[PDB]
Write an enzyme that holds these catalytic residues in place. Sequence first.
Site, mmCIF file in Angstrom:
data_model
loop_
_atom_site.group_PDB
_atom_site.id
_atom_site.type_symbol
_atom_site.label_atom_id
_atom_site.label_comp_id
_atom_site.label_asym_id
_atom_site.label_seq_id
_atom_site.Cartn_x
_atom_site.Cartn_y
_atom_site.Cartn_z
ATOM 1 N N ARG B 16 0.857 -1.183 0.000
ATOM 2 C CA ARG B 16 0.000 0.000 0.000
ATOM 3 C C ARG B 16 0.895 1.236 0.000
ATOM 4 O O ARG B 16 2.122 1.143 0.116
ATOM 5 C CB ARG B 16 -0.957 0.007 1.192
ATOM 6 N N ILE B 18 3.181 4.516 -0.553
ATOM 7 C CA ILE B 18 4.312 4.780 -1.439
ATOM 8 C C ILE B 18 4.825 3.491 -2.074
ATOM 9 O O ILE B 18 5.114 3.445 -3.281
ATOM 10 C CB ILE B 18 5.422 5.519 -0.669
ATOM 11 N N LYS B 38 4.669 -7.268 5.291
ATOM 12 C CA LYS B 38 4.343 -8.080 6.458
ATOM 13 C C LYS B 38 2.857 -8.384 6.536
ATOM 14 O O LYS B 38 2.465 -9.318 7.247
ATOM 15 C CB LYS B 38 4.791 -7.385 7.745
ATOM 16 N N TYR B 151 11.728 8.796 15.201
ATOM 17 C CA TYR B 151 11.531 8.655 13.762
ATOM 18 C C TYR B 151 12.570 9.448 12.984
ATOM 19 O O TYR B 151 13.184 8.926 12.051
ATOM 20 C CB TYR B 151 10.126 9.109 13.363
ATOM 21 N N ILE B 184 3.445 12.951 1.613
ATOM 22 C CA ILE B 184 2.824 12.138 0.565
ATOM 23 C C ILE B 184 1.517 11.590 1.121
ATOM 24 O O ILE B 184 1.491 11.042 2.228
ATOM 25 C CB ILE B 184 3.737 10.984 0.116
#
Lengths: 258, 258, 258, 258
Positions: B16, B18, B38, B151, B184
């Site tokens: 799903r 990008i 996964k 992150y 995005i």
Amino acid sequence: GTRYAGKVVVVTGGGRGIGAGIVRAFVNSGARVVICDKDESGGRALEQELPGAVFILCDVTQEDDVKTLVSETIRRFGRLDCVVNNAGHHPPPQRPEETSAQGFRQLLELNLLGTYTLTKLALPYLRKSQGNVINISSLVGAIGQAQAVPYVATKGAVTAMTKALALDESPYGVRVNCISPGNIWTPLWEELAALMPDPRATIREGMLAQPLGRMGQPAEVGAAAVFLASEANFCTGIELLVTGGAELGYGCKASPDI
Amino acid sequence: GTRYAGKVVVVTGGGRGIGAGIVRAFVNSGARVVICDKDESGGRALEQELPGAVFILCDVTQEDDVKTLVSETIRRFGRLDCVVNNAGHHPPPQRPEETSAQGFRQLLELNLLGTYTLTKLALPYLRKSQGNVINISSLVGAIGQAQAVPYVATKGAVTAMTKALALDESPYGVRVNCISPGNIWTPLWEELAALMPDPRATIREGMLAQPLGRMGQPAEVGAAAVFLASEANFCTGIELLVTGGAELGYGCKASPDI
Amino acid sequence: GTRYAGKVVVVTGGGRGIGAGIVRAFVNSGARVVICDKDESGGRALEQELPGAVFILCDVTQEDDVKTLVSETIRRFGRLDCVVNNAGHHPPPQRPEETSAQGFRQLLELNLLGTYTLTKLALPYLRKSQGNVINISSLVGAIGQAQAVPYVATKGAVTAMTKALALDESPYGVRVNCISPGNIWTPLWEELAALMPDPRATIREGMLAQPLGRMGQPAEVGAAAVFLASEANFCTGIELLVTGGAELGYGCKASPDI
Amino acid sequence: GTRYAGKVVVVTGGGRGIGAGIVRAFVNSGARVVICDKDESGGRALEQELPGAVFILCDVTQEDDVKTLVSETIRRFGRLDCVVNNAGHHPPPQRPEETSAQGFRQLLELNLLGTYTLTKLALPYLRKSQGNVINISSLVGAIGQAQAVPYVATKGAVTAMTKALALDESPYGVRVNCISPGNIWTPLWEELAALMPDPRATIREGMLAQPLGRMGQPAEVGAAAVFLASEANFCTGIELLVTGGAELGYGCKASPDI
Ligand SMILES: NC(=O)c1ccc[n+]([C@@H]2O[C@H](COP(=O)([O-])OP(=O)(O)OC[C@H]3O[C@@H](n4cnc5c(N)ncnc54)[C@H](O)[C@@H]3O)[C@@H](O)[C@H]2O)c1
Ligand SMILES: NC(=O)c1ccc[n+]([C@@H]2O[C@H](COP(=O)([O-])OP(=O)(O)OC[C@H]3O[C@@H](n4cnc5c(N)ncnc54)[C@H](O)[C@@H]3O)[C@@H](O)[C@H]2O)c1
Ligand SMILES: NC(=O)c1ccc[n+]([C@@H]2O[C@H](COP(=O)([O-])OP(=O)(O)OC[C@H]3O[C@@H](n4cnc5c(N)ncnc54)[C@H](O)[C@@H]3O)[C@@H](O)[C@H]2O)c1
Ligand SMILES: NC(=O)c1ccc[n+]([C@@H]2O[C@H](COP(=O)([O-])OP(=O)(O)OC[C@H]3O[C@@H](n4cnc5c(N)ncnc54)[C@H](O)[C@@H]3O)[C@@H](O)[C@H]2O)c1
Ligand SMILES: O=C(O)c1ccccc1CCC1Oc2ccccc2O1
Ligand SMILES: O=C(O)c1ccccc1CCC1Oc2ccccc2O1
Ligand SMILES: O=C(O)c1ccccc1CCC1Oc2ccccc2O1
Ligand SMILES: O=C(O)c1ccccc1CCC1Oc2ccccc2O1
Ligand SMILES: OC[C@H]1O[C@@H](O)[C@H](O)[C@@H](O)[C@@H]1O
Ligand SMILES: OC[C@H]1O[C@@H](O)[C@H](O)[C@@H](O)[C@@H]1O
Ligand SMILES: OC[C@H]1O[C@@H](O)[C@H](O)[C@@H](O)[C@@H]1O
Ligand SMILES: OC[C@H]1O[C@@H](O)[C@H](O)[C@@H](O)[C@@H]1O
Ligand code: NA
Ligand code: NA
Ligand code: NA
Ligand code: NA
């Protein structure tokens, strides 16, 4: 002797090398300095040498060592103004296929997560003092290095983390900056060169990697750290290069268009 | 339909977002594509939809899953030309004091070490094909983000690692590049916005963070990936920004000189 | 009061704003300072105010004014250790179609060629003293600005020129660095805001463009300049950001993916 | 053969070198191409060779030549979709004291103001077509070069100007990007090497300045340009490096810490 008077500074990996240079610079600026190191030899001697510096044995990969480092700093000196996350290591040159995920994890624990953990535990006190964080990253986090994939990754992480934390702590007046040294002549540089087939040639190449034609000194990194702590009040999230110009210009990168 | 014909590409997290956009771009370029994810739902449907794509269930944090991914790609298609390390996650916004070292380790396992492990296992085959590696990093690895210290650190690491590996693999003719997207519009963006007090306002702010005034599309990241694989033969170690200009100019960064 | 004692510094555009802040910082460091400005009012008053500063009327776009500036500095003080190229201007906001090639040339004359000319004339003396050059560029040379194509171009040129000259002068021990300020509250900032429909709103937006939530001060740029001159002996070709974090994180750049 | 079909592209300095490579790439993509050059020899031959390319004699430093270039493009082809500002020059190596302000002005006229002037005259038509601008800058604008202060300054200006114009034109849907090549084997590279004491040694050093161990080709720059024009719809204000990794890693920058 007064530009950082009355302030309390913690320097990790302060027993030798860049860390010791940073310790000396802060003492010379009037600060009280807590030297953290996992090894006793250099740091204990530095405490004896420098009035205003004390040594606390502390492995930054051990969360409870770091908790004790912070609580003892506060118990002994009553405030905390600056944390310098200098502890780190560069492995010997390793080809990518010679690295392992578990070695990569171990290097992340020291170079990245130790910086993260001390910073986290210190931030409540840094908020009270409107203090600041200085992370020692590397030029190679920005431009890469050969035979050092795990090391380069850890320093790219430190530099990026510096910017993220700068954003998060800006509302509290706590600045977060990093210094990215290039080739600094330290016991680690000397140890790494000694592993090479021709240590003298490796050292000469290291000197000639800078347009200035020499390596840097721990004292020069220390001066940059004292600047960031004491006089850079509008600097947050910056990467201060202390590299002698190594990133500038064309050089020899390989051992006409096909 | 022919710019990457005859080539074999592995896209991680390709089910799903990008990743799926990158899968579609490579199929449209003539490549055979192995979709790793996964989760079964999206990737299995993509295999059914796209001739030339197949789905292999694989969690990139599980070294033996990744070994099987590579060995099955070679067994089924006979070569490997490009690895796109797209699998990754962005946690919900977290203040620094709300993060943990163990959560940071877990995010490093996915965003950094999964990329490292697949790349390591693939490189012997990429050397044979003079293939290439494309890592999906983030703009926030370069400029930081608020409420995302772990992150941001992981993506700073990916971008730096890209440069180090580019240096190491250049003698073999294997290029290593990264794409750093900005905002995005993906299922993850939508999920993160849904957690916010005013999801609609969060989405609008996300659109206005770009001078272009919209978010990007997976197809736009996919086109950049196909360029890097098929036509960027003198590009190695680059960070290709797919951000709509978010890094440009002054903007609103706080919620006259004192 | 002694970190740059015995040294001689020339600051262009030193009569007000950032330039005056740099003059004050160097005087406070123990240096003798030559204030260059095309306007008499501020610089003459600064000479009267500061022991150790003198004013020389000099328009940096006039090559013979600059020759006289250098020869008078040497005649009066016997050496030259640092040149700070601060003189520059930011036009009012101009859409690209509202700019002209001749206006662009005029702005290049001040912001770029004046820096070039003073540096050229000073370098023989800087070589004798192993002195250094500090150029005042701008953050917008690095990240762009809206409605300022000529200005942004001139500062991109200054930053790049700094690196080229650093390379050329490194064999002589002469360092060349730049400072890139972000929003600094100066008479020029105030003048530009006064031209806007809602000056108060423009100023508030300027404060909120930094994560720190305020603009910077001339004194903060001055401290960075004194650092580069006096204590940054392994720094050459660097761009020192004095921006309050304006380049960090996502912000509002436009007035979901289509 | 169809990725930029129906589109009209102007390439300045398109008669040889990188420019000719860009012309060929756009013709191969299905575009009609107007070759601008101040010299007739190469460009006239390229028109004869390539269906879909035409040659217009035009010196980009002459504003009325450029006005005629734009008006003839529109008269002959009815639209304008992409301007590639490639015309530029690199002087022979020059020490800073050997440069002149008037030579610096002359180089700014070509490398910077010619790009500015064509872009300005083209933008009304690019707005109608939601077209784009591609500027050919240089890696040395970003990292510096020795013996090239004026040249480096001009390319720092081009890269910065690209970002400023990207901001200004984003509301109109017009993207503005640049390509920064490193060492590309072109007639200019060959001419510059021929001036050196040992041209063969200079060329070998130029090849070894890249980790890839070769120089780049005009076709590789051309492919990057076609990507930016045709498939990079979320890219604006980017600097696309086509350098073979020259900016990565440590190298030889000088001819242990003192
Ligand atoms: N020397 C260089 O050229 C250079 C260049 C760029 C960055 N750096 C960085 O500068 C820092 C210091 O490097 P150096 O060359 O001075 O190294 P060094 O090995 O000479 O000194 C590092 C010090 O840190 C201590 N240390 C190591 N692991 C520790 C741990 N777990 N807990 C506490 N202390 C620990 C060591 O005992 C030592 O005293 C590192 O972060 C390194 O990555 C160095
Ligand atoms: N969406 C954005 O704005 C944005 C911006 C910058 C960077 N990125 C990066 O792009 C990548 C994709 O982001 P996205 O928005 O498409 O996310 P997403 O959550 O929509 O899709 C990610 C896909 O990866 C899969 N995945 C997750 N963990 C995995 C694992 N352990 N093994 C295998 N597959 C796994 C998921 O199941 C999913 O199909 C990530 O690396 C992300 O950090 C995204
Ligand atoms: N204020 C900011 O936010 C800011 C931000 C980034 C960069 N800068 C740069 O900092 C520098 C100073 O900016 P400022 O805001 O202090 O401006 P300012 O207008 O307040 O002060 C500039 C000074 O330079 C002098 N000057 C102008 N042209 C000159 C010439 N031809 N010869 C000699 N002196 C001349 C002026 O008379 C004035 O005293 C400039 O280079 C500017 O581009 C400013
Ligand atoms: N070759 C490299 O390694 C390299 C590297 C980085 C950047 N660049 C840039 O790429 C561009 C092309 O370089 P090149 O190596 O192909 O050069 P080149 O000299 O081989 O070709 C340049 C072309 O531009 C034309 N030209 C020059 N001045 C002109 C003018 N006033 N008006 C119109 N046309 C004009 C020339 O006649 C020639 O056909 C330049 O902008 C250069 O700065 C080149
Ligand atoms: O750059 C760094 O971050 C770094 C960190 C710590 C110590 C030294 C350095 C410089 C590069 C290092 O020095 C070497 C010497 C011999 C072989 C390999 C080497 O790599
Ligand atoms: O930028 C990134 O790398 C990224 C990666 C994956 C998904 C989205 C992004 C954009 C930032 C993200 O989007 C948010 C939405 C609501 C709250 C916080 C958010 O952060
Ligand atoms: O950033 C720069 O280099 C700069 C240089 C000199 C002065 C001020 C600045 C900040 C941007 C400037 O401040 C403005 C205020 C009102 C409208 C437009 C403005 O642009
Ligand atoms: O890099 C640039 O932008 C560039 C632009 C045009 C042509 C060539 C280059 C590469 C550097 C150039 O090549 C040389 C060869 C001999 C001496 C000096 C040289 O400099
Ligand atoms: O071991 C190499 C160098 O390391 C530095 O940290 C010390 O300050 C120097 O005295 C020593 O020469
Ligand atoms: O869920 C948000 C978006 O995610 C993208 O990956 C899909 O391609 C879009 O169809 C969807 O609107
Ligand atoms: O005019 C705006 C500001 O300019 C600065 O240069 C001065 O130091 C301040 O006193 C003044 O408030
Ligand atoms: O002159 C050097 C090189 O210049 C390039 O532009 C040409 O395409 C090559 O054929 C030539 O070898
Ligand atoms: Na002591
Ligand atoms: Na299929
Ligand atoms: Na005086
Ligand atoms: Na033709």
